[PDB]
Design a protein around this ligand. Sequence first.
Ligand SMILES: *[C@@H]1O[C@H](CO)[C@@H](O[C@@H]2O[C@H](CO)[C@@H](O[C@@H]3O[C@H](CO[C@H]4O[C@H](CO)[C@@H](O)[C@H](O)[C@@H]4O)[C@@H](O)[C@H](O[C@H]4O[C@H](CO[C@@H]5O[C@H](CO)[C@@H](O)[C@H](O)[C@@H]5O)[C@@H](O)[C@H](O)[C@@H]4O)[C@@H]3O)[C@H](O)[C@H]2NC(C)=O)[C@H](O)[C@H]1NC(C)=O
Ligand SMILES: [Zn+2]
Lengths: 6, 598
Amino acid sequence: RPKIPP
Amino acid sequence: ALVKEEIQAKEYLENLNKELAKRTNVETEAAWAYGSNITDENEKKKNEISAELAKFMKEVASDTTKFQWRSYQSEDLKRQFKALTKLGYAALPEDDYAELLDTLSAMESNFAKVKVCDYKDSTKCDLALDPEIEEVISKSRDHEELAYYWREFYDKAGTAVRSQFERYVELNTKAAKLNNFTSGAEAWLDEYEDDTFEQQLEDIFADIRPLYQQIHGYVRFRLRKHYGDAVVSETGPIPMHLLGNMWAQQWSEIADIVSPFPEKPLVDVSAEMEKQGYTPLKMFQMGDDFFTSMNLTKLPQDFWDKSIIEKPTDGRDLVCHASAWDFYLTDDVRIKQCTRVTQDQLFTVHHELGHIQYFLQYQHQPFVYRTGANPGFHEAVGDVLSLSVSTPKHLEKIGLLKDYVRDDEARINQLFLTALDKIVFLPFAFTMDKYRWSLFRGEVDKANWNCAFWKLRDEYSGIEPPVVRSEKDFDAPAKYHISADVEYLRYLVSFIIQFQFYKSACIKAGQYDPDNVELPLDNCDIYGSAAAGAAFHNMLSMGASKPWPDALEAFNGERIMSGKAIAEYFEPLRVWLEAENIKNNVHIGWTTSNKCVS
Ligand SMILES: *[C@@H]1O[C@H](CO)[C@@H](O[C@@H]2O[C@H](CO)[C@@H](O[C@@H]3O[C@H](CO[C@H]4O[C@H](CO)[C@@H](O)[C@H](O)[C@@H]4O)[C@@H](O)[C@H](O[C@H]4O[C@H](CO[C@@H]5O[C@H](CO)[C@@H](O)[C@H](O)[C@@H]5O)[C@@H](O)[C@H](O)[C@@H]4O)[C@@H]3O)[C@H](O)[C@H]2NC(C)=O)[C@H](O)[C@H]1NC(C)=O
Ligand SMILES: [Zn+2]
């Protein structure tokens, strides 16, 4: 899955 | 015999990995389309492809049992086979998997479609979190205006999906148990390959917690002076809506009202960025420049051609929470970010480009190894650069910070500003997964689900809702990661280990010496450092090919996750802040919140 900011 | 089988198995893995990459690419494309353009049609397409891949994974997991893989000589082949046994949600029966995916998109699309009415204009009801609501939360100092937007958002992004969230927990648990984990908590924790991982985090959190309590106390003290004691009490939890962030996860937006030395410089380059005509394109080009300056990989043409780096201007619904995407071919990597021209966004750009760099570094690895050493490693990469980007040293170089004198007082301001991001976040990050773990594990009765959320936020962060909530509300999914089923412990791990990487990169760059006053850790810029880049290449190129202690060792020779480096970074702040709180007779700690009625 995509990597996202906190 | 086993010798002949292991030769055959190596061939099987090589073929299967390539097939999995190609199939995942197809699923990823449909997911990208949906996130870029939310419609019923694209949802259906996204979920049907995933159902198809889930079915294929089921047969893969089944086929692994035909190989005597646990008997093999090759640690590498055994590791690959073990990865293939891990079905996750794909373990669910066909109908259960479909229902879970429908449940997940219902929650993510609810979050993405949230619109509220203008506080001053009850007919203007097209205000989205990104950017309209977040702009008010970050800039407004009208406590009643802030409370209004808090209530409107949480009611719409949280409470509206209680039933869906409940079903999600049920299906997450069922999936976990089909994989023979006790719950989704153990499923998530499996990613860290360490049976003492929770205890390790508790121990590190316990060491940094006293520093957080000093920061919390000082912030509360300063907020009292700004808002008055009718809004902020000395002894109670901080009303969270005053902390400049919808979830109070990072407090840097209120730095101008809580900074140690208001007459000395406080770094905020947003205005200079706007003045100099910065664009999202420029910001991404600058991020690219940072990576290439370190002798790391340039962004490929596909990135520039296919990325979405600005919020679309048509009517469409989309997910604006930034994201970095690996399409599992060669050089097809993308970001979708609703980019704004601010200092904070400049950090987000570098953060997300850290993921892209990771993708490119390990794209030659077998499919199953094309991921982070652990989830925390992936989140840490971009943050190491953002730590450097944030320094007065770097911001002066690039012409964004002007007329800056770095005296002792400016240094404390900058350290405190960093801490409002980096220390404040630790209890926040811990609670997001402690909450979900407790639900996954069946430790909280359904009747107590909401106040169990606010209880944790109180116990760990000492913050509370601006208004009284109850079990009639359901506030947790108002946080994007909770609606979108994205594990959060990765960020707690990241904020710890990113200081280990940063300290080591800075030493390698010749930018940090503890015995030299001219080279403080808090002013280290690794821009242009090939030696720092070499360390990243060694670690990132490994992907998930080895357990994460081996990936850390490849970077700096260490094998242990440690809070030493983060404490070292903030030590001058700790000393100053402890003294300043005593000087001002600042109350530390908080009474139990009255803001969630059971
Ligand atoms: C999560 O945990 C689950 C257990 O809690 C686990 O489920 C078990 O998986 C086992 C498969 O590994 C399975 O074992 C088989 O059982 C068959 C008979 O079981 C029936 O009766 C039970 C009641 O007594 C019921 O409860 C069941 O529902 C069944 O109806 C056996 O017929 C079968 O056997 C065959 O397979 C073995 C192969 O084993 C290995 O392979 C090679 C073959 O070359 C061997 O040389 C090697 O030494 C090794 O043994 C052969 O030895 C044998 O000749 C047969 O061909 C097998 O034992 C078990 O039934 C199942 N359920 C339970 C309740 O135990 C899940 O697999 C776990 N899930 C995950 C994802 O890990
Ligand atoms: Zn991220």
